[PDB]
Amino acid sequence: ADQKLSDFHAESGGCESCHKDGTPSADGAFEFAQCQSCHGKLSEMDAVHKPHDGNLVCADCHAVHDMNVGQKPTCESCHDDGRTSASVLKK
Ligand code: HEC
Ligand code: HEC
Ligand code: HEC
Ligand code: HEC
Ligand SMILES: [Zn+2]
Ligand SMILES: [Zn+2]
Ligand SMILES: [Zn+2]
């Protein structure tokens, strides 16, 4: 049993949880503002998240309409050094 991350959110909050009047914005800014309003800012999150504050929006990693709940983003589309989440979060 699988659910897209967008549907997981919309089942509780509507499409409007992320989209003004349920309609996407051209630049993703309204959506990013909504993610941060609920979840906090990148700068307030863990070591995978913090360094992306000022360079990415959430959706650059969490493709909410194409990823299921539980799926973890990986790093290779922007980093060519083979890094992993664990290499930043495990000591
Ligand atoms: C936040 C968790 C979201 C919810 C809930 C819904 N959508 Fe969304 N949508 C979201 C983002 C961050 C983006 C842009 C980046 C991306 O991943 O695509 C979108 C994009 C759309 C689009 C444009 C087409 C596309 O790029 O996929 C549409 C038409 C759209 N979203 C519609 C939509 C509907 C109808 C929703 C409720 C059922 C819905 N979205 C929920 C973020 C989120
Ligand atoms: C509030 C109205 C929210 C907005 C806007 C967005 N999210 Fe969210 N998210 C919300 C809740 C209440 C939860 C459940 C928390 C939990 O215990 O899981 C979530 C969950 C997620 C998750 C993880 C889901 C899981 O794997 O368990 C992700 C990755 C996530 N949210 C991302 C996300 C993004 C990218 C958003 C904007 C595009 C976003 N969320 C909006 C509440 C709300
Ligand atoms: C890639 C560079 C990311 C960006 C930008 C954001 N997220 Fe993320 N997120 C990413 C990974 C690889 C993971 C799994 C490993 C980890 O560090 O936990 C996550 C995880 C989450 C979670 C779940 C946290 C948990 O349950 O332990 C949530 C709720 C989440 N991410 C939300 C979120 C939001 C709201 C973002 C923008 C503000 C965001 N993420 C950016 C990768 C990346
Ligand atoms: C693009 C969409 C990215 C994805 C996917 C991931 N990262 Fe990233 N990261 C990105 C940028 C634009 C930057 C700043 C410029 C640069 O590449 O240096 C970063 C930076 C980091 C850093 C700071 C250290 C450094 O690389 O200089 C860390 C620790 C980091 N990123 C970790 C990381 C991880 C673990 C990812 C996958 C889970 C990941 N990034 C994905 C853009 C993007
Ligand atoms: Zn959860
Ligand atoms: Zn770098
Ligand atoms: Zn490199």
Q: How was this structure determined?
A: X-ray
State how many domains the chain has.
1
* Closest Cα to atom 27 of ligand 3: 46
Q: Which residues constitute the domain of residue 53?
A: 1-91
Q: Determine whether the annotation assigns residue 14 to a binding site.
A: no
Q: Is 12 left (phi over 0), alpha (psi -120 to 50) or beta?
A: alpha
The CATH code of the domain that includes 11 is 1.10.1130.10
Q: Is 3 left (phi over 0), alpha (psi -120 to 50) or beta?
A: beta
What is the stated resolution of the deposited model, in angstroms?
A: 1.4
Ligand 2 site-directed mutation target among 9, 11, 42, most atoms within 8 Å of CB: 9
